[PDB]
Write a structure and sequence with these properties.
homododecamer, elongated, binds heme C, binds fe (iii) ion, binds zinc ion, Soluble cytochrome b562 (chains A, B, C, D, E, F, G, H, I, J, K, L), heme binding (chains A, B, C, D, E, F, G, H, I, J, K, L), iron (chains A, B, C, D, E, F, G, H, I, J, K, L), iron ion binding (chains A, B, C, D, E, F, G, H, I, J, K, L)
Chain lengths: ~110, ~110, ~110, ~110, ~110, ~110, ~110, ~110, ~110, ~110, ~110, ~110
Amino acid sequence: ADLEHNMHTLNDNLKHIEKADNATTVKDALTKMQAAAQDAWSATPPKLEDKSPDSPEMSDFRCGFWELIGQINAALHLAKQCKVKEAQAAAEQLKTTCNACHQKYR
Amino acid sequence: ADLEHNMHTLNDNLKHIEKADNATTVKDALTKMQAAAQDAWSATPPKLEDKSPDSPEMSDFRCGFWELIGQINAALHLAKQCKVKEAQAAAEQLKTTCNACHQKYR
Amino acid sequence: ADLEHNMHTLNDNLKHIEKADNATTVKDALTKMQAAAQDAWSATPPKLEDKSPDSPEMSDFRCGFWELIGQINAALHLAKQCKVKEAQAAAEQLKTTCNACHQKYR
Amino acid sequence: ADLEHNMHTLNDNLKHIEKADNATTVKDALTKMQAAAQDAWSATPPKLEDKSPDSPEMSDFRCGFWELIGQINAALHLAKQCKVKEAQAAAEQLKTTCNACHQKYR
Amino acid sequence: ADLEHNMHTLNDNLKHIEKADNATTVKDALTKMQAAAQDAWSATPPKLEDKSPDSPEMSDFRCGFWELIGQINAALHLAKQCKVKEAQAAAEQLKTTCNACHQKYR
Amino acid sequence: ADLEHNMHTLNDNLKHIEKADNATTVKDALTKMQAAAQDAWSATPPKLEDKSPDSPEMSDFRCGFWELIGQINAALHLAKQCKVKEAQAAAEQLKTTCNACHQKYR
Amino acid sequence: ADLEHNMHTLNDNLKHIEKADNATTVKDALTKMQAAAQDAWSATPPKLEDKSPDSPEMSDFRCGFWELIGQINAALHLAKQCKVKEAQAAAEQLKTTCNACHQKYR
Amino acid sequence: ADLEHNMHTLNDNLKHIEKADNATTVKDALTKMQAAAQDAWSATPPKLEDKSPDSPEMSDFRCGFWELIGQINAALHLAKQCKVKEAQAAAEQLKTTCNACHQKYR
Amino acid sequence: ADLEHNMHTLNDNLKHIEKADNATTVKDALTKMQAAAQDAWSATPPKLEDKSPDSPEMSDFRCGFWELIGQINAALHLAKQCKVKEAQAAAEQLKTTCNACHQKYR
Amino acid sequence: ADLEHNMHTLNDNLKHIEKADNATTVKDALTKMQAAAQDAWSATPPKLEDKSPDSPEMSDFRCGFWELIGQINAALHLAKQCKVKEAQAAAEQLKTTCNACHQKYR
Amino acid sequence: ADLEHNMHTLNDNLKHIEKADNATTVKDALTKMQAAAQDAWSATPPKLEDKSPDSPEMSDFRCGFWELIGQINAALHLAKQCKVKEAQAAAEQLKTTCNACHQKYR
Amino acid sequence: ADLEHNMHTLNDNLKHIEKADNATTVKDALTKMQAAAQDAWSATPPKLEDKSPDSPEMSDFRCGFWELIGQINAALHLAKQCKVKEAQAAAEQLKTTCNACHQKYR
Ligand code: HEC
Ligand code: HEC
Ligand code: HEC
Ligand code: HEC
Ligand code: HEC
Ligand code: HEC
Ligand code: HEC
Ligand code: HEC
Ligand code: HEC
Ligand code: HEC
Ligand code: HEC
Ligand code: HEC
Ligand SMILES: [Fe+3]
Ligand SMILES: [Fe+3]
Ligand SMILES: [Fe+3]
Ligand SMILES: [Fe+3]
Ligand SMILES: [Fe+3]
Ligand SMILES: [Fe+3]
Ligand SMILES: [Fe+3]
Ligand SMILES: [Fe+3]
Ligand SMILES: [Zn+2]
Ligand SMILES: [Zn+2]
Ligand SMILES: [Zn+2]
Ligand SMILES: [Zn+2]
Ligand SMILES: [Zn+2]
Ligand SMILES: [Zn+2]
Ligand SMILES: [Zn+2]
Ligand SMILES: [Zn+2]
Ligand SMILES: [Zn+2]
Ligand SMILES: [Zn+2]
Ligand SMILES: [Zn+2]
Ligand SMILES: [Zn+2]
Ligand SMILES: [Zn+2]
Ligand SMILES: [Zn+2]
Ligand SMILES: [Zn+2]
Ligand SMILES: [Zn+2]
Ligand SMILES: [Zn+2]
Ligand SMILES: [Zn+2]
Ligand SMILES: [Zn+2]
Ligand SMILES: [Zn+2]
Ligand SMILES: [Zn+2]
Ligand SMILES: [Zn+2]
Ligand SMILES: [Zn+2]
Ligand SMILES: [Zn+2]
């Protein structure tokens, strides 16, 4: 899918995690965020469209999705041990990673 | 396979992309280039054979294949939307990545 | 599994490689080390528990497991060609990578 | 998933169909709408929560999702024949079915 | 496939059931009739092409295929118990269902 | 299987749901009731054996199993969210559906 | 499942074998008895609950299910050769095995 | 298959093991002997046809196949480590097990 | 694997069961103990290396692993019902079985 | 199926290829013709029923289906490259192969 | 396997077909003869060992196995329709094909 | 793929067989040559483009690929028995088959 629809999936499933009361809801929402972040890792943002794909802008862009994938995988590891409150607090810390990318490329 | 045969697969399938007229030929050639670049990422070139596997030469070598994998994945994303001319121009830009590695390790 | 049990798998299977006499034992022990290193890449060590997940400590920690995964994949490539002595000497070189991480985070 | 999230999937994927330019985007969005409508067929709306599950309100509710499933299946049949404009006009006619259910149960 | 080819499959396989002498022929012909009736359930006949898909004509059309699917499933249940004469007489009763639909929409 | 054995499966698994204390027992008993109700939907009861398969008795018989399948699917949806008491109370409401069918066809 | 429900499956499917008239009914009932006897082999009866799991009571209990599994497998071997009367008489001989266990542990 | 054909498979594949020169021939012949010994474990020999299936003859018969299965599994364990001479000498020791059963039941 | 490595798997996973706090850790550790006990059932201990494989020492050795497999299967049955304390106390009783084998063959 | 029904499949799907307007219809009709020609290759025509299966009539009969299979495979190769007009003209040339067999054996 | 063992499979399974009384025995023996004839089609007989693989002896050898494969496939087609006597008489006609090859190459 | 790319696969993998030192390289190169020769069997060479597909030129063309497939299958049979020198000498004999086809159709 597009980069814009992959951001629809990350935004919608993150709001379902804060309101969840069981561990099946948190575990299923974190699996869709993992698949949407891997599809968006190779894309090109509209503000870097006239650059070459070897640029230091396109190197820092791909390094930001690989930090997000490692944090989604760590929060999914807590949800499989049925630790709902620990997995919900780990997903709240995701917003500092995706505020730092919006200041540069969004 | 060897590093030498993985370079046979990348070179042969790239010449079939420039002469293709349908979107099934471009989509099938980009899938073989993706599998050959992942097998070659862990190999050791003959000009770095007497180094240790923690070297800053063996760190820049593996960083060059991971930039190529992200560009093959982006060109395969355009070919599945049946955009043949956009996927052919993205594969022409691959040659700047693999001219910069040949000056250092080939 | 935990970070502590993933270190049990890497330590036990490495001692079986030095005493092996056939190529089926070396090839099966290197496959379990590959799966245990990928599960441990996203974890948090106890000495970095009060840091944020965007830290330059948590960036150098994940860069150390990705260097180990590339060396296990290269030694598994020699074991499938039935080169037992070359795959055993490549697994002995793994100890320099995992002595440098124990000085900083263990 | 909930009834509320199944309505998030139907609303988001319908807006991607009107702006699509290829037949792979239309065919993939209609497949997610088919799976979200089948999961929502058995649910209970909040305005019928104090009824019994044998009611003539809960009979007309389930008859409305089965009319929608037959229209999504017919529009997916046109998209597999690469008829993009015919499948886009069939998805615009879906809004009369889901305006008649919102007047009674939403 | 089209509505016209799905009627080719129902007509041809019904004539093979009356002339069959073993239970493997009857069981294989009833499986193709089941798959052709489910593909035709969502289609639009040419005499209802200018109606809306919420019509009481398009509601009685889909109710007629769902009565046929339940009769094919019951005759396939007798053929798996190796009751050839009971499954052949149940397939002869199918013609009253598909004479009543031809008077209205064919 | 027969209609009589499909009623053995619905009756036995319903009594195990009222006495269950964990969510794995409720989730496994509701899956067998779903498969037994779909096999019985196409059958013919002994009190309608001399009717034709287009009758308004055989239309109300198949409409009664389709209401039961939607209630088993809704109770299985609560059991996967580990809501044991809500799924047990939804299975108690199933008895009004299957008292109304026994007054007419049993 | 429990030990009590595994005895529900053995008792119900044995009564369907004596009344069967085709070889598909006998072959399907003997397959469910095979799966229910293997799940019950490791269980603990309520009259041996305060023993240790190394007892000579718990050794004779597990030896009785392993004699029953070999007799169900032999009767299923006759049913696949379409020998219905030989497989029905072999299932009648099962009752001497399960009268000898009820005198000691039931 | 029959008891007589399962003895055809054990006799033919044992003579191919003594004449083999590679480890693929020994490993493939020992896999067919494992499947033929498990199918024959539940059978009834012609010299015990008029006994009951709870007899001490039918208990010593099944104990003899379970000793053979453990010896075939141990010889297959040596063949996967590419130890051809050790796996060939372990298959020669199988003949003492199957001379002791022929004196009693053949 | 060897007999010595199968004892590494049983010893390590048993110590993780006593310190576990959730039911996913207990259920995953009991599955690895089940696979390691079945691979070790056919092996030969070093203190019985000069015996024949029909010995009454090699008959009591294989009878000891089959008692352990039935106790691991019973403790895994409690862990799937999310009964953590009952499955932890059943795994503590395993040590009497494996103290009696070490006095004779270790 | 019979030889007569395999000729029903070849005749019906060939008339759908000349009237097709997309490449999904041509590609799906050529796949059913490939499976029907392979099932008919081993059959015996009614005009050669009293011959032996080593005859020079039964050798020229099987050589005629093997020429047809190679022409269906070549036309299916053009349809996967989305060349509809080239695949439709290749299927028109099939009629010379199946006019030459009807003059001798039909 | 070898050419000699593939002739062991064809000879043993042909003698089980003449003595069979059900259709499951004939259908299972004809499936093993089909797999053994395809493995032997590419082999080289010992009396043609010093020829080149382009010889007119090695062309008539491969043409003889391809006539046998078509006769085994035709006899397996009768066995799936539960025609035991027709499939047994078709397997008796196989001996004329394999007497003509033994006069030239055996 | 094209006929020209299928000749790229046969030419490249044949040169890797003469320089190989293990049996995994020879076995993997012979598997790609088998798949490329089956895709090229149905193609049309450019020097026979204006012929009809029933010609005696197009009959001798398809007979030449079927002789090559039988020689690749025989050399792959030696490589699975770990006979590297016998499989390398069998692949050298392939060049006489593909010199005789180049004199007529290339
Ligand atoms: C860069 C490394 C990013 C990370 C990590 C995340 N996002 Fe993102 N976001 C990024 C870009 C370049 C864009 C614009 C691309 C475009 O064409 O839209 C966005 C956009 C969004 C949006 C707006 C969607 C829209 O309809 O325009 C949303 C709602 C959004 N992003 C959400 C979001 C969140 C919550 C993230 C953290 C978990 C996140 N994104 C990651 C770049 C990057
Ligand atoms: C480094 C990061 C590389 C990238 C990206 C690509 N190649 Fe490569 N190439 C590299 C090395 C170290 C070598 C020598 C290894 C050896 O032992 O051969 C090569 C070699 C080639 C060759 C020559 C093959 C031969 O037979 O010797 C070719 C034809 C080749 N490379 C092609 C190629 C192309 C077109 C690439 C860009 C898409 C490419 N390679 C990537 C290092 C690296
Ligand atoms: C960092 C990048 C590491 C690499 C690479 C390896 N190890 Fe490790 N090790 C690391 C940490 C942070 C820890 C402590 C975590 C904890 O909570 O235990 C460890 C620990 C070990 C242990 C001790 C296990 C225990 O019971 O405490 C062992 C035996 C061990 N590590 C082995 C080991 C080896 C041999 C490695 C090289 C192949 C290796 N580990 C990799 C960090 C890192
Ligand atoms: C009944 C038979 C419906 C059909 C068909 C569709 N919808 Fe629906 N919708 C329905 C209900 C009962 C509700 C309220 C349930 C709740 O608890 O939210 C809704 C709600 C929506 C919403 C609001 C989502 C929210 O966050 O509250 C949207 C955006 C929505 N529905 C969209 C939608 C569209 C576009 C449909 C046609 C294709 C459609 N729904 C189908 C009942 C029914
Ligand atoms: C409606 C609920 C139907 C049922 C049940 C069956 N058929 Fe049908 N049939 C129907 C329509 C609307 C049409 C015309 C559609 C078109 O465009 O052709 C048909 C047509 C046929 C045909 C003619 C095929 C042709 O080439 O034109 C045949 C041979 C046919 N139908 C057979 C058939 C039989 C035997 C059925 C009972 C088992 C049956 N169909 C079901 C509507 C409906
Ligand atoms: C009709 C729409 C039914 C629904 C829903 C349920 N049952 Fe049923 N039941 C039905 C019939 C027509 C029959 C008689 C068929 C026969 O030949 O037996 C039955 C019978 C039973 C029985 C008796 C079984 C026996 O051995 O005779 C039982 C125990 C039974 N039914 C249980 C049952 C329950 C509890 C249901 C609700 C969940 C239920 N059935 C559904 C018709 C219908
Ligand atoms: C021991 C080795 C047994 C064999 C073989 C069979 N059964 Fe069993 N049975 C056994 C026990 C220990 C129990 C009591 C366990 C409990 O908690 O219920 C039973 C019970 C039954 C029952 C009663 C079920 C109930 O609701 O209480 C039945 C109907 C039953 N058993 C049937 C049965 C038959 C017919 C068997 C032979 C084929 C059989 N069981 C095997 C112990 C053993
Ligand atoms: C009992 C516990 C046995 C073991 C272990 C083996 N065999 Fe057997 N064998 C057994 C019986 C009861 C019979 C007679 C059954 C019958 O109806 O044929 C046999 C027979 C044979 C035969 C003769 C086959 C024939 O055509 O009659 C052979 C060639 C044979 N057995 C071989 C064989 C070998 C070599 C075994 C050791 C590995 C072996 N069998 C195991 C009983 C038992
Ligand atoms: C016999 C029937 C045994 C059972 C049940 C268990 N073990 Fe074992 N153990 C057994 C033998 C014959 C041996 C020696 C084999 C060898 O060559 O090592 C062992 C050894 C061990 C060891 C030592 C491992 C080592 O490195 O030498 C351990 C740690 C061990 N066994 C643990 C263990 C436990 C805890 C068991 C109960 C659950 C158990 N084993 C089962 C024989 C048998
Ligand atoms: C021989 C090598 C054949 C080829 C190639 C094709 N057909 Fe055939 N055809 C053949 C025979 C021996 C028979 C008679 C068998 C019988 O018992 O019917 C037929 C028959 C037909 C029929 C008539 C079907 C009927 O109901 O009788 C049709 C419509 C038919 N064939 C069509 C057909 C076409 C169009 C083919 C070319 C693509 C074709 N067949 C191939 C022998 C052979
Ligand atoms: C050639 C085209 C053959 C066909 C068809 C069949 N066989 Fe064969 N057979 C053939 C050869 C070249 C050989 C000798 C190869 C060798 O090294 O053994 C054989 C041998 C046999 C044997 C003897 C086996 C042995 O142990 O030596 C048997 C029992 C045998 N063949 C049986 C057989 C039957 C019954 C066939 C018809 C169905 C048949 N083979 C096919 C060549 C050919
Ligand atoms: C006919 C029966 C052939 C066999 C067997 C092999 N080849 Fe071929 N070859 C054939 C043709 C008709 C053509 C020309 C087709 C075209 O359009 O190119 C070829 C061509 C080649 C080439 C040239 C590739 C190119 O880029 O033009 C090569 C390198 C080649 N063939 C290699 C080759 C080898 C080594 C073969 C033996 C194993 C072989 N081919 C088989 C016809 C036939
Ligand atoms: Fe980096
Ligand atoms: Fe080897
Ligand atoms: Fe209705
Ligand atoms: Fe015993
Ligand atoms: Fe839980
Ligand atoms: Fe297209
Ligand atoms: Fe039958
Ligand atoms: Fe020929
Ligand atoms: Zn995507
Ligand atoms: Zn979207
Ligand atoms: Zn490789
Ligand atoms: Zn190469
Ligand atoms: Zn893990
Ligand atoms: Zn551990
Ligand atoms: Zn849902
Ligand atoms: Zn949502
Ligand atoms: Zn269709
Ligand atoms: Zn048609
Ligand atoms: Zn059924
Ligand atoms: Zn029953
Ligand atoms: Zn159970
Ligand atoms: Zn029960
Ligand atoms: Zn068998
Ligand atoms: Zn036999
Ligand atoms: Zn093992
Ligand atoms: Zn170990
Ligand atoms: Zn067929
Ligand atoms: Zn037909
Ligand atoms: Zn073989
Ligand atoms: Zn043999
Ligand atoms: Zn191809
Ligand atoms: Zn090429």
